[PDB]
From Swiss-Prot:
GO terms for molecular function: cytokine binding; cytokine receptor activity; identical protein binding; leptin receptor activity; peptide hormone binding; transmembrane signaling receptor activity. The lineage of its organism: Eukaryota, Metazoa, Chordata, Craniata, Vertebrata. It comes from Homo sapiens. Belongs to the type I cytokine receptor family. Type 2 subfamily. On ligand binding, phosphorylated on two conserved C-terminal tyrosine residues (isoform B only) by JAK2. The gene is LEPR. Residues 176-268 form the Fibronectin type-III domain. This is Leptin receptor. Disulfide bonds join C15-C27, C26-C36, C68-C79, C123-C133, C125-C130.
Length: 268
């Protein structure tokens, strides 16, 4: 009921025609479904909109790319806003505010949150159209349900994104590996070792792309391991091994993590 899972992570948002209280209806254009859910922030915005000005909206295509996710360290929530229209003739000073709430589980009716429940945090926006938000989230509220509704204020005009329901834990994006070393085990195997973050409450599966790459012999192999070290049987002498790792949730779908540094090892 009024809850749509994000499947898949790639979605298209389009606003089409049917001040302080100008409401625009935007919907997600999926391959097989068309869902139009309005945010609960404003419910009494039933105000008439002149059709004459709608033609102006025909000349401006409301296409924006905003990516909000939770980092793998479970410390900061990263929201990136980038404008595809890189025009230097107009540098609009826009402010992005992150409105988030963490309601508790109540067994006495599903009460609707009132106005002002969402916390207002002013992000630090740089001069090159980049805004960084640092929201201190306690570890005790990580297992709760988080609902977000992006709000953009520009010249007295308010734009509200459609409500989305998703668990932030399904898109773990850990820090890039550091202190990782490659060596040859005395038993005759290659160890690539890195120090995984200890703040993750569950084991994380890691897939590494490797391929024996000789002058003629080519052999690309892939395996998924969760330990801090990888065991490969009967490493081949005189071969080049490249290591590149990306993150993904063990259970169900997920979002690929950052592209780590690919490292090359050449055996004699």
């Amino acid at each position: 009921n009024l809850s749509y899972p994000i499947t898949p992570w790639r979605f298209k948002l389009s606003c089409m025609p049917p001040l302080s209280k100008t409401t625009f209806h935007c919907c997600f254009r999926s391959e097989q479904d068309r869902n139009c859910s309005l945010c609960a922030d404003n419910i009494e915005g039933k105000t008439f909109v002149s059709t004459v000005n709608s033609l102006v909206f025909q000349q401006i295509d409301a296409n924006w790319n905003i990516q909000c996710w939770l980092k793998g360290d479970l410390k900061l929530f990263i929201c990136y806003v980038e404008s595809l229209f890189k025009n230097l003739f107009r540098n609009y000073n826009y402010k992005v505010h992150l409105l988030y709430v963490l309601p508790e589980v109540l067994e006495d009716s599903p009460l609707v949150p009132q106005k002002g429940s969402f916390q207002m945090v002013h992000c630090n926006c740089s001069v090159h159209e980049c805004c960084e938000c640092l929201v201190p989230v306690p570890t005790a509220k990580l297992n709760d349900t988080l609902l977000m509704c992006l709000k953009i204020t520009s010249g007295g005009v308010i734009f509200q994104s459609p409500l989305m329901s998703v668990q932030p834990i399904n898109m773990v994006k850990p820090d890039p590996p550091l202190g990782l070393h490659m060596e040859i085990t005395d038993d005759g195997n290659l160890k690539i070792s890195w120090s995984s973050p200890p703040l993750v409450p569950f084991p994380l599966q890691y897939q590494v792309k490797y391929s024996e790459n000789s002058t003629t012999v080519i052999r690309e192999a892939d395996k998924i391991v969760s330990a801090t070290s990888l065991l490969v049987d009967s490493i081949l002498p005189g071969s080049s091994y490249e290591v590149q790792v990306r993150g993904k949730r063990l259970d169900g779908p997920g979002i690929w993590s950052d592209w780590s540094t690919p490292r090359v090892f050449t055996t004699q």
